[PDB]
Structure 1
Amino acid sequence: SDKICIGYHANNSTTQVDTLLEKNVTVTHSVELLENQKEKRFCKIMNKAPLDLKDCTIEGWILGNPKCDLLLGDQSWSYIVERPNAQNGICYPGVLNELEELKAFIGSGERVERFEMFPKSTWAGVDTSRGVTNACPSYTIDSSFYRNLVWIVKTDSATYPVIKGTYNNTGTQPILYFWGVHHPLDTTVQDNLYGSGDKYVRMGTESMNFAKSPEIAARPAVNGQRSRIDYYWSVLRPGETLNVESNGNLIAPWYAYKFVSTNKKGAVFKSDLPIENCDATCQTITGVLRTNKTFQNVSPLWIGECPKYVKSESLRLATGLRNVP
């Protein structure tokens, strides 16, 4: 007898999906929506390389720790990579005030131009040429200091007079800059470095004012030092002017950075992964994703255009039908 039948496709597929009613249903066609593979490295993004801080922390880099000279100068970066065991940060003991906001501000940038903001001649009648310490060696000298600051002391034969500096930001870019206040371990050291009298550091802008005095005390030794420096940072906006005024204890700004804020998202990755010469469009903290997929279970932290992060092992969508061969 002549015959006609109605039916449906089957094939050699062993690929399975799950449904609300049933697990492990083999289907003829399907599409995986989740990426789970990564190249365990750091690559360029928008073909701009990341900045590798190597053996420096963000603090050491930006303050100019003498052991961070290979980073010294202008930098452009698609993101920043900080190594978890980096040893060179703050060499002369103390606190960098509002550190977390500093880290966030820098991570929102893409470029810095280093420049001399207050030349040493700014400060009249004081010594700008010692201000060097064994807490803060270079690779070439045992006793040195941050390259972006000047530790001013009195000359041998005179008092520390009132000193003044000013800087007018006539450019179109905000300026990231630093200063400090030295806090000696005792009165003897205070008097050796700055002479007697009530000392003050005052800084001022159209929109910020700062005032501090030394706080003398012997604290536990760190890198040989029982004294401290309180470090500070601020942002001199375009069109603003900064006035500095002190009669003692000033760790003065010297070099600062013209700072360009990205209109992307910026990132600081804390990771030991290697940087290589490769391009990428999607870079997570744990590696690059090369994928057109819409989900990924590699990492929630990334820059570039990445798939959405989820905890799933697999997100496989059936397109064809139940495979019954």
Structure 2
Amino acid sequence: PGATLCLGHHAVPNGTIVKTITNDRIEVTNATELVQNSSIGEICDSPHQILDGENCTLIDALLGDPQCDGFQNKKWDLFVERSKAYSNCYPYDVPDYASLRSLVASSGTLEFNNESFNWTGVTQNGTSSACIRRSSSSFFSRLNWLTHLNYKYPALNVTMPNNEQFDKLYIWGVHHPGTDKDQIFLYAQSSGRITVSTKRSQQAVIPNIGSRPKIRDIPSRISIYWTIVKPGDILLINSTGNLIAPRGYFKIRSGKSSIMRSDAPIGKCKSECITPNGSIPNDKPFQNVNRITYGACPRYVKHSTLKLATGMRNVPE
């Protein structure tokens, strides 16, 4: 009689199809998905420090648009800019806007220190009905609109040394009046000049007079510039008109901070990986949710599914 001894292996009734080098569809006992394809639709507020911009762009929070006063001196790991955001102060532009936005985002702080420039011979604190703060005509909080005093605008030549151990970021601008009359009414002379310099840089700007389309009834514009002043260096502002002066400096830091455009709500939860769609889990090595990511994130790929076999070939009877 004797015996029979058979060697064999398991199988399952519910196998999974995977791809290999030689076969686009082969059934195995089990697999695991390597492409994360969903978000929870909210940005978790831990572990990254999230600052919700609400109605404010980062640049408006920097300059000090009145609706952004709550952002003064705030810090973030990730600043979230919303598509509903709008400007509601004096009309302005920023040559190389994207660069100023990037460098502030990456710095992660709006910490601002006031400095006394001792502006002498000019009127300070110019305001506009385009920039309403507490029902009164106002202006960007961090900027100082200088105009004539007694129909004289005497040449400004002002120094501010950096005696600190850190870099200072100065934000300033040039006012472009809508007409030649407005140039006189504000600066009591026909041609402004601004030169802002350090030992290692110089920026010279000429206003360009002319009508731009009216925003909150203003055909004029301000153009925003920035200057970084290193320790041991000196800021030198030399101007005969059209200066929108700084009130102080921002701390500029280095670290892990950034900015992201998203309409996802902020949630009370923990997730290392943030996308504009919301936080996503980061167990899987890849994801197809969004190319835009912040934190410890799976790598973006253009595959909806990649199944890794975790078992042998499934061979049912």
Please confirm whether the aligned pair reaches a TM-score higher than 0.5, indicating the same fold.
yes
Check the 8 A contact 2:167/2:230 in 1, yes or no: yes
AA of the residue aligned to 1:214: P
TM-score, normalising length: structure 1: 0.90
SS in 2 for 1:192: helix
Counterparts of 1:66-85 in structure 2, within 5 Å, are: 66-72=66-72, 74-85=73-84
SS in 1 for 2:289: coil
Q: Deviations over 1:200-251 (max 9, x none)?
A: 2221101111222332222322221112222212222233210112222111
Shift >4 Å, 4+ stretches: none
Partner of 1:196 in structure 2? Answer: 189
Are 2:115 and 1:117 equivalent residues in the alignment? yes
- How many Å separate the matches in 2 of 1:20 and 1:159? 82
SS state of the match for residue 302, structure 2? coil
Q: 1:196 to 1:37 in 2, by over 3 A?
A: closer
* Structure-2 residue corresponding to 1:294: 285
Which region of structure 1 is more displaced relative to structure 2, 63-72 or 287-296?
Answer: 287-296
For 2:21 and 2:191, the matched residues in 1 are separated by 77
Note closer, same or farther for the CA distance 1:323–1:315 as it changes in structure 2 (3 Å cut): same
Instruction: Answer yes or no: is the 8 Å Cα contact 2:147–2:187 preserved in 1.
Output: yes
C-alpha contact (below 8 Å) 2:169/2:226 kept by paired residues: yes
2:128 counterpart (130, 133, 147): 133
Q: State the Cα deviation string for residues 77-108 of structure 1 (Å, max 9, x = none).
A: 1111000120126x322321221111221222
Distance 2:48 2:27 in 1: 45
Q: Distance in 1 between matches of 2:4 and 2:100?
A: 80
Matched residue of 1:8: which SS?
coil
Q: What's the CA shift for 1:172?
A: 2.6
Assess if the C-alpha contact under 8 Å between 2:288 and 2:301 holds in 1.
yes
Question: Shift in Å at residue 57 of structure 1?
Answer: 1.4
Residue type matched to 1:43 in 2?
A: C
Confirm or deny: 8 A CA contact 2:48 2:272 kept in the other structure: no
**Residues 237-277 of structure 1: per-residue CA shift (max 9 Å, x gap):** 23321011222211111133111111x3x432111111122
What is the 5 A alignment of 1:240-319? 240-262=233-255, 264=256, 266-319=257-310
Residues in 2 aligned to 1:229 and 1:76: alpha-carbon distance in whole angstroms: 27
Of 142, 145, 148 in structure 1, the residue corresponding to residue 139 of structure 2 is 145
Partner of 1:182: 175
Code of the aligned partner of 1:151: W
Find the aligned partners of 2:232 and 2:62 in 1 and give their Cα distance. Answer: 23
Aligned with residue 207 of structure 1, among 200, 211, 219: 200
Please say if residues 43 and 49 of structure 1, whose CA atoms lie closer than 8 Å, have aligned partners that are also in contact.
no
Q: In structure 2, list runs of 5 or more residues that go unmatched.
A: none
Structure 1 residue 197 displacement after superposition: 5.1
TM-score, length-scaled by structure 2? 0.92
Deviates most, 78-87 or 266-275: 266-275
Does the aligned pair in 1 maintain the 2:64–2:142 contact within 8 Å?
yes
- Over 3 Å counting, the alpha-carbon distance change for 1:110 and 1:94 in structure 2 is closer
Closer, same or farther in 2 for the Cα pair 1:313/1:43, shift >3 Å? same
Matched position secondary structure for 1:4: coil
Q: Aligned equivalents of 2:38 and 2:221: distance in 1?
A: 48
SS at match of 2:109: strand
1:27 match: 28
Question: For the residues of structure 2 that align with 1:252 and 1:208, how far apart are their CA atoms?
Answer: 18
Measured in 2, the distance between the counterparts of 1:168 and 1:24 equals 70
1:102 aligns with 2:100: yes
* Residues 13 and 323 in structure 1, CA contact (< 8 A), matched pair in contact too: no
Structure 1 Cα separation of the partners of residues 128 and 158 of structure 2: 24
The one-letter amino acid paired with 1:49 is: Q
Alignment coverage as a number of residue pairs: 315
- Return the alpha-carbon distance in structure 2 between the equivalents of residues 145 and 220 of structure 1: 20
Q: 1:111 to 1:214 in 2, by over 3 A?
A: closer
**Residues in 2 aligned to 1:13 and 1:114: alpha-carbon distance in whole angstroms:** 62
Instruction: String of CA shifts for 1:138-168, please: whole Å, max 9, x gaps.
Output: 2x1241100010111112x341112232222
Q: Does 1:65 align with 2:58?
A: no
Alignment of 1:153-172 (within 5 A): 153-155=147-149, 157-172=150-165
